[PDB]
């Protein structure tokens, strides 16, 4: 790209991911802060729509965060980002869509339409979004206008401090009545994939999560449920 109004579509986009070392620091007063990134999910696209969802709480966000945050009783999200990176050609048919819900009791969207309304909605070609790399690697950012990544509006959730919950116990509780979840988890990410060319799933991309959390009030890892 040289002038203005002109754009060039490549045969394929390339993003070399390199995750740096976790950042931990015991800030006086009790809070221990941790900022880090992890591969959150594997993406595949079909010709018919498919809606997936993930709870945004420590145990489910990332595999490392799970084991680490378990040593503390409560926590508070400070920043949560779900960045999408493509691993296919510009010749691949398909689009992705993401957004948030906050009342686990609400129904999970069933149309790209309903989804376009949610908080922090994002949509893009299955083969793009390589621009959002700067978020995961933690480098200086350029033109992120073409990136597929969304964030949680931490500033307006039920409460500030939630309890560290384990998938197991969470499920056991939700089993009684879903509404018991509202005081356990802040929100959930919704993900839709359609506009593909095959009836059998195809390699689309992958989603990485980059978060910053505050952990408080220590407890033996084994007692935490």
Residues that bind a second copy (rule: CB under 8 A) add up to a total of 134
Q: Is 225 annotated as a binding residue?
A: yes
Of 57, 60, 77, 92, which lies in the binding site for a second copy, with binding defined by CB under 8 A?
A: 92
Q: Which of residues 12-31 bind a second copy (CB under 8 A)?
A: 12-19, 30-31
128: contact with a second copy by CB under 8 A:
yes
Q: Between residue 170 and residue 199, which ones bind a second copy under the rule CB under 8 A?
A: 172-173, 176-180, 182-184, 194-197
Listed in sequence order, the residues at least 6 apart from 224 whose beta carbon sits closer than 8 Å to its beta carbon are: 70, 71, 73, 164, 166
Q: Contact at 8 Å (CB) between 162 and 184? A: yes
Closest CA to 81 of 159, 127, 150, 30: 150
Asked whether residue 153 is marked as a ligand-binding residue, the answer is no
Residue sitting closest to Ca ion (CB): 103
d(CA 224, CA 201): 38
Does 47 show up as a binding residue in the annotation? Answer: no
Q: Which is nearer to Ca ion, 146 or 182 (CB)?
A: 182
- What's phi and psi for 161, nearest 5 deg? -100, 115
**Least distance CB 66 / a second copy (angstroms):** 10
Quick one: DSSP state of residue 108? Answer: P
HSE on the CB side for 141, CA within 13 Å?
A: 13
Among 51, 53, 54, 123, binds a second copy (CB under 8 A): 123
Which residue positions form the known binding site? Answer: 103, 106, 164, 224-225
């Amino acid at each position: 790209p040289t002038q203005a109004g002109i754009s060039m579509a490549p045969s394929a986009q390339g993003a070399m991911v390199r995750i740096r070392n976790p950042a931990v620091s015991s800030s006086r007063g009790g809070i221990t802060v941790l900022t880090h990134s992890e591969l959150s999910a594997e993406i595949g696209v079909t010709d018919s729509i498919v809606v997936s969802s993930e709870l945004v709480m420590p145990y489910t966000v990332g595999t490392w965060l799970r084991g680490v945050a378990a040593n503390w009783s409560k926590y508070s999200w400070l920043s949560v980002r779900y960045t999408y990176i493509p691993s296919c050609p510009s010749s691949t048919a398909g689009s992705i869509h993401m957004g948030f819900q906050y009342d686990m009791a609400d129904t999970v969207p069933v149309s790209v339409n309903q989804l376009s309304n949610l908080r922090g909605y994002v949509s893009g070609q299955v083969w793009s979004g390589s621009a959002g790399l700067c978020f995961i690697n933690g480098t200086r950012c350029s033109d992120t206008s073409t990136a597929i990544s969304t964030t949680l509006d931490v500033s307006k959730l039920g409460k500030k401090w939630y309890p560290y919950k384990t998938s197991a116990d969470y499920a056991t509780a939700v089993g009684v009545d879903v509404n018991i979840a509202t005081p356990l988890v802040p929100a959930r990410l919704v993900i839709a994939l359609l506009d593909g060319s095959s009836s059998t799933a195809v390699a689309a991309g992958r989603i990485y999560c980059t978060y910053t959390i505050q952990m408080i009030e220590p407890t033996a890892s084994a007692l935490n449920n």
